[PDB]
RNA sequence: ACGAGACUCUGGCAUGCUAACUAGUCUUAGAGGGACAAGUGGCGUUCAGCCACCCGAGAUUGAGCAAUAACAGGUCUGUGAUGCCCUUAGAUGUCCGGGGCUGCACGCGCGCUACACUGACUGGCUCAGCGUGUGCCUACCCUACGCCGGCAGGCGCGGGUAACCCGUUGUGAUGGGGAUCGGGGAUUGCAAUUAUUC
């Protein structure tokens, strides 16, 4: 139970710029497509256990999960583990990266804004698209 | 505001902190975690390695407080 | 089969029990072995209704109950004995369903 | 893991840390002082124990030493007869404040 | 409260003056004799009357009572 | 002509298909166990049906 | 010729068929202290160490134990063992020894023979619960 | 002289039976073992790596209690609550495609099969096989 | 003499009782028993009664019903229950039909909601509902396997007038509880967005 790895005070995965304060391997919120049941399924399929020491965990596991996410369609694995599915402009699940870019694409509002629809301006004002009631409850969204 | 503690495994520094725990009156992972201010899981791994050396015996398992003792 | 069942159902325990006892006595006078009564859990027909015909006042509700009791008794006898013991001037309310199965 | 007796600390922190008076309301108005009374030691000791439960919480709630590892402190709270506590010395400060009317 | 209303009080008094011979002190016996000699249309009221007659015999065994 | 209009789209929740069997009242219907009355009419006849206040 | 009393508590129950045989103790149909909840293992160990082996060296007991709730099926097991043991001692040997042993067991604690009478009460009138009421507006 | 297989605490009982079944060595899991959420009250996917053996054994325990237990009532120890956002709850279960895939993987094992009337049924020969195996591994090297 | 109590219903209790081929006397429901301030102490013209304690399943134990005179409280929009002053044909009959009110600078009133090894998944041991359920109407009832992406389920498939079927229904913003909002097959409700759907 002794590892020859050294403690690293500089570690970089996906070219983000965030503070390293708490532990790792489930504070991966900065990493957008790895974690929870999909990562657990991949890890259990990789046949690795929890025998070693916690806290000092490197990024080989997350890199392997990302790499297996690169080409998931070949193995016929159930493809309901990706963010934007059945989207316009591509019938296949294409890869993207970088911070400050996923958030924009989480709301593809360009086409609905173009068609002069009420749902575009429902989304735009930050108000309720499905119609959450907001007159006595539901005042959050701007605080 | 987590503290910075030397966890590096070295030729010299490593074999000076693995022989300081038994030099205290009440030595348990909870007590060492409240007093020496290092994760209790490190103490858990330490007493597990002491078990691996064959000088103690396991009784029960728990994610917080483990039970390894001796009767000799 | 000679297996016959009698289902006695009524809203009160007194008339139902008196009818059951009289039927069991009549069957037992004959040298016949008869299974003991079986008591169903007496399903309760609750109905809650607002008291006020209008919509004024404190919200007050009538809780109406209709308690239906049902008993089954098993025996072995030809039809003539059953239809001779049935016509015994039954007291009102104790509905009788006699089945052969 | 002890081998020895916890009896010493067991007894000698709490079960005579305990206060000896509390305070009660006065007249028909006025919330600026409270008249000093006592209780038969059971109710006073158990009010001190309840505030010590609050203190053990605040030593766990937003703190380092957690719940289900203070068995030494619980045995201290339990056994019999000397003085080392914290919430009970708060209670004793209030003791003196109220007793300033005796 | 356990105040015995006029019904149980009057019943116990009339019971004790009419058949003092049969009635005793042990609640089981008072209940039995009360059922035997009094047409009480309840069971709870019967137990109440028997309890009060037991109390009244505890009263009479140590002096006279005006009722 | 008549059949050119009637039965075009089925009304599977027709409210007007029910009424109080005593006074023909649209509201407060009691369809449970088949009473099919306005609750006021049921209160009027509940004791006669067999429903009683026990609790 | 039917001396059986089983043991029931709250909602759970355990039929304890007690009969003479080789005289060995079988409890829970599973190992002694391995039970999955792990909450109340030590509480079960009071009688087997308080009584001894000679006392239960002739008892063949087979238990049908059912019931959800630790407070229900647990403590029902202890009521069951106490009641079955008391009945067996009363019937098969004498009554003075029964008084001694049963006095010991039910003097260890009282809750053996008494079940809790508390039960959920009816939701009351014009309020979310049995006592709470919908907020009154002025 | 005659042993029932629910003789030990079912944790280690299913552990030993699944150890034997997995050491049979002729069965490998398909690619749709764990990716199923099954019931919403769970947070993750199956991990045991023997969940088929224990699922078949537990179904068997339900079978023992109830004939034709395809619909035998389930028991969920953890909770009576399931708060699911903006609508009330349901009653725990798993997936049906998983059931048929596991039954396709179950053929030739003489463990559990369907019935002509709706539900499941027990394999007596495999029943006695597991009985004898459990008895002769419990009375040989675990208590001697 | 009403009212209060008593009384009915309701839960609480049998090493007891009347018996069921769906449980094995545990579930169901009995002509019945059991508590009464009863036993003992302490307060009470030592009265009515109050406190306490063994004992006991239970020791001010849920509700229902509930006194004349009442009030211009509500109801004529529940009622061929009701006395007639009195409008309009835009009858306040009908016909999957048609704007709203699902606005947000709020004018108000019921409503939707828990702070950390307690909150939440490993799915690794037998759980409860109180109750509902299909033709005088009537055409609308509750529900178990397969096409399989990951289950309600687009179609067949049986059971249930119901105890028989549904159904034994590491020191605090991190991993921890969700601010709008998008994909998978959608339960088949014209329209749901001008309220149905993981």
Of G5, G64, G79, nearest to G29 (Cα)? G64
Of A58, A78, A98, the residue at which a domain comes to its end is: A78
Q: Are H9 and G31 in contact (CB under 8 A)?
A: yes
D33 touches chain B (CB under 8 A): no
Take residue H85 and report the two structure tokens written for it.
């956002």
Torsion angle in degrees (nearest 10) through CA of A79, A83, A89, A95: -80
Q: Where are the beta strands (DSSP E) in chain G?
A: 7-9, 12-20, 59-66
Taking the C-alpha atoms of residue F7 and residue F36, their distance in angstroms, rounded to an integer, is 25
Q: Is G56 exposed, middle or buried (0-12, 13-18, 19+ CB in 10 A)?
A: middle
CA of H94: nucleotide with nearest C1': I151
Domain of H78 in residue numbering reads as 1-144
* A35 lies in the same domain as A74: yes
Exposed/middle/buried for residue G116 (C-beta within 10 Å: 0-12, 13-18, 19+): exposed
The answer to whether C98 touches C86, Cβ cutoff 8 Å, is yes
Q: In chain H, which residues have their Cβ closer than 8 Å to the Cβ of A130?
A: none
> Residues H121, H63: contact at Cβ < 8 Å?
yes
Instruction: Say which nucleotide is closest to residue E59, CA to C1' distance.
Output: I47
The CATH code belonging to domain F1-55 is 4.10.830.10
The answer as to whether E66 is a domain residue is no
- Per the structure, the count of domains in chain E is 1
Chains that touch B (3 or more CB pairs under 8 A): A, D
Nucleotide nearest to C70 (CA to C1'): I29
Q: What share of chain G is helix, strand, coil (3-state, %, to 5)?
A: 30, 15, 55
Neighboring chain G residues of H8 at a CB cutoff of 8 Å: 30-31
Q: Do B64 and D68 touch (CB under 8 A)?
A: yes
According to DSSP, residue G117 is labeled: -
Q: Minimal Cα distance from D65: which residue of B?
A: B34
Question: Is there a single domain that holds both residue A83 and residue A72?
Answer: no
Distance of CA H67 to the CA centre of its chain: 16
Same domain, A3 and A72: yes
Please tell me the distance in Å from D92's CA to the nearest CA on chain B: 28
**Binding partners of D (≥3 Cβ pairs within 8 A):** B
Experimental technique behind these coordinates: cryo-EM
**From the CB of residue C92, how many other CB atoms can be counted at a distance below 10 Å?**
7
- Beta carbons within 8 Å of D54's beta carbon, 6+ residues apart: D87
CA dihedral E27, E28, E30, E33 (to 10 degrees): 170
Q: Is F23 marked as binding a ligand?
A: yes
Q: Which domain holds residue E12?
A: 1-61
Q: Under an 8 A CB cutoff, do G34 and H10 touch? A: no
Domain end marker among A78, A108, A132 = A78
CATH topology of domain G1-138: Ribosomal Protein S5; domain 2 (3.30.230)
Burial readout B16-50 (b: 16 or more C-beta within 10 A, e: otherwise): eeeeebeeeeeebbbbbbbeeeebbebbbbbbeeb
**First-to-last CA distance in chain F?**
58
Q: Strand pairing partners for C9? A: C70, C95
Separation CA D41–CA D47 (nearest Å): 10
Residue ending a domain, among A40, A61, A78, is A78
What would the two tokens of residue G68 be?
A: 């959800």
Question: How far, in Å, CA of D41 to CA of D51, rounded?
Answer: 15
DSSP conformational letter for C62 = E
Quote the number of domains for chain H.
1
Q: Is the CB of C48 under 7 A from strand I?
A: no
Question: Is the CB of C92 less than 7 A from some atom of nucleic acid strand I?
Answer: no
From chain A, the residues in CB contact with H85 under 8 A are: none
Q: Does residue F11 have a known ligand-binding role?
A: no
- Provide the resolution (angstroms): 2.9
User: Does residue F20 reach within 7 angstroms of strand I, measured from its CB?
Assistant: yes
Tokens at residue A35, please?
A: 């974690």
Comparing C-alpha atoms, which of D80, D43, D73 is closest to residue D58? D73
With b meaning 16 or more CB within 10 Å and e meaning fewer, what string describes E1-32?
eeebeeebbebbbebbeeeeeebeeeeeebbe
Nucleotide at minimal C1' distance from the A129 CA: I181
Query: Which chains sit next to C, with 3 or more Cβ pairs under 8 A?
Result: F, G
H126-to-H21, H51, H67, H129 alpha-carbon distances in Å: 12, 19, 18, 5
Backbone angles phi, psi at D18, to 5 degrees: -40, 145
Phi–psi pair at H142, nearest 5 degrees: -125, -15
Q: In whole angstroms, how far apart are CA E55 and each of A5, E25, G46, G78, H98?
A: 91, 8, 46, 41, 76
What are all long-range contacts of A31-36, with beta carbons under 8 Å and residues at least 24 apart? A31/A62, A32/A83, A32/A102, A33/A66, A33/A69, A33/A82, A33/A83, A34/A62, A34/A65, A34/A66, A34/A69, A36/H43, A36/H44
Structure tokens at C23: 């039927």
Tell me A28's DSSP state. Answer: G
Q: How many residues can be counted in chain B?
A: 72
Of the candidates A35, A64, A46, the residue with the CA atom closest to the CA atom of residue H49: A46
Spatial CB neighbours of F22, under 8 Å, sequence gap ≥ 6? F37, F38, F41, F44, F45
User: Which single residue is written with the structure tokens 């025998």?
Assistant: A51
Q: Which residue range is the domain that position A126 belongs to?
A: 79-143
- Chain F CB contacts of C53 under 8 Å are 40
Report domain extents, chain F. 1-55
Nucleotides of strand I within 7 Å of the protein's CB atoms: 4-16, 18-20, 24-31, 33-39, 47-50, 55-58, 60, 62-65, 73-75, 78-81, 94-96, 102-104, 106, 109-112, 116-118, 120-128, 130-133, 136-140, 144-153, 162-163, 166-172, 174-176, 178-184, 189-190, 193-194, 197-198
Q: How far apart are CA E41 and CA F54, in angstroms?
A: 20
Residue E6 covered by a domain: yes
């Amino acid at each position: 139970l002794v590892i020859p790895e050294k403690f690293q005070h500089i570690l970089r995965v996906l070219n983000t710029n965030i503070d390293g304060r708490r532990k790792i391997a489930f504070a991966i919120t900065a990493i957008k497509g790895v974690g929870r049941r999909y990562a657990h399924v991949v890890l259990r399929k990789a046949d690795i256990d929890l025998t070693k020491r916690a806290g000092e965990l490197t990024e080989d596991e997350v890199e392997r999960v990302i790499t297996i996410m690169q080409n998931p369609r070949q193995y016929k694995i159930p493809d309901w583990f990706l963010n934007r599915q059945k989207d316009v402009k591509d019938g296949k699940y294409s890869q993207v990266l970088a911070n400050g870019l996923d958030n924009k694409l989480r709301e593809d509002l360009e086409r609905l804004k173009k068609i002069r629809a009420h749902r575009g301006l429902r989304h735009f004002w930050g108000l309720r698209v499905r119609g959450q009631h907001t007159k006595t409850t539901g005042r959050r969204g701007r605080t | 505001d987590k503290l910075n503690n030397l966890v590096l495994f070295d030729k010299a520094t490593y074999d000076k902190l693995c022989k300081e725990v038994p030099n205290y009156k009440l030595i348990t992972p909870a007590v060492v975690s409240e007093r020496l201010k290092i994760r209790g899981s490190l103490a858990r791994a330490a007493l597990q390695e002491l078990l691996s050396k064959g000088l103690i015996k396991l009784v029960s398992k728990h994610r917080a407080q483990v039970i390894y003792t001796r009767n000799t | 089969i000679h297996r016959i069942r009698i289902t006695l159902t009524s809203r009160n325990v007194k008339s139902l029990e008196k009818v059951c006892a009289d039927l069991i006595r009549g069957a037992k006078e004959k040298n016949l072995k008869v299974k003991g009564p079986v008591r169903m859990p007496t399903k309760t027909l609750r109905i809650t209704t607002r008291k006020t015909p209008c919509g004024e006042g404190s919200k007050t509700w009538d809780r109406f109950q209709m308690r239906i009791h049902k008993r089954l008794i098993d025996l072995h006898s030809p039809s003539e004995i059953v239809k001779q013991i049935t016509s015994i001037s039954i007291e009102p309310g104790v509905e009788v369903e006699v089945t052969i199965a | 893991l002890t081998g020895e007796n916890p009896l010493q600390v067991l007894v000698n922190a709490i079960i005579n840390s305990g206060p000896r008076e509390d305070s009660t309301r006065i007249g028909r108005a006025g919330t600026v002082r409270r008249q000093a009374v006592d209780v038969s030691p059971l109710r006073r000791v158990n009010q001190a124990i309840w505030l010590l439960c609050t203190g053990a919480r605040e030593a766990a709630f937003r703190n380092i030493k957690t719940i289900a590892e203070c068995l030494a402190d619980e045995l201290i709270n339990a056994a019999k007869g000397s003085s080392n506590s914290y919430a009970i010395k708060k209670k004793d400060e209030l003791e003196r404040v109220a007793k300033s009317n005796r | 409260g356990r105040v015995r209303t006029k019904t149980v009080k009057k019943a116990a008094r009339v019971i004790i003056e009419k058949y003092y011979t049969r009635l005793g002190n042990d609640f089981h016996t008072n209940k039995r004799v009360c059922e035997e000699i009094a047409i009480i249309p309840s069971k709870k009221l019967r137990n109440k009357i028997a309890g009060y007659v037991t109390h009244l015999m505890k009263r009479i065994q140590r002096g006279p009572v005006r009722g | 002509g008549h059949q050119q209009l009637y039965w075009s789209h089925p009304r599977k929740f027709g409210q007007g298909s029910r009424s109080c069997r005593v006074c023909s009242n649209r509201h407060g219907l009691i369809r449970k166990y088949g009473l099919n009355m306005c609750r006021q009419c049921f209160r009027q006849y509940a004791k006669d049906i067999g429903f009683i206040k026990l609790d | 010729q039917s001396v059986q009393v089983f043991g029931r508590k709250k909602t759970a129950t355990a039929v304890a068929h007690c009969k003479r045989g080789n005289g060995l103790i079988k409890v829970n149909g599973r190992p002694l202290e391995m039970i999955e909840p792990r909450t109340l293992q030590y509480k079960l160990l009071e009688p087997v160490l308080l009584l001894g082996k000679e006392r239960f060296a002739g008892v063949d007991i087979r238990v049908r134990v059912k019931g959800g709730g630790h407070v229900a099926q647990i403590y029902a097991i202890r009521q069951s063992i106490s009641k079955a043991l008391v009945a067996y001692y009363q019937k098969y040997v004498d009554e003075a020894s029964k008084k001694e042993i049963k006095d010991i067991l039910i003097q260890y604690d009282r809750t053996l023979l008494v079940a809790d009478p508390r039960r959920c009460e009816s939701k009351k009138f014009g309020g979310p619960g049995a006592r709470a009421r919908y907020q009154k507006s002025y | 002289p005659g042993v029932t297989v629910k003789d030990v605490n079912q944790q280690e009982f299913v552990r030993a039976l699944a150890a034997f079944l997995k050491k049979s060595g002729k069965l490998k899991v398909p690619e749709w073992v764990d990716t199923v959420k099954l019931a919403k009250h769970k947070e993750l996917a199956p991990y045991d790596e023997n969940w088929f053996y224990t699922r078949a054994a537990s179904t068997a325990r339900h079978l023992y209690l109830r004939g034709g237990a395809g619909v035998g009532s389930m028991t969920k120890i953890y909770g009576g609550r399931q708060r699911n956002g903006v609508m009330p709850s349901h009653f725990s279960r798993g997936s049906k495609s998983v059931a048929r895939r596991v039954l396709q993987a179950l053929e030739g094992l003489k463990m559990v099969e369907k019935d002509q009337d709706g539900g499941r049924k027990l394999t007596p020969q495999g029943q006695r096989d597991l009985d004898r195996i459990a008895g002769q591994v419990a009375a040989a090297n675990k208590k001697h």
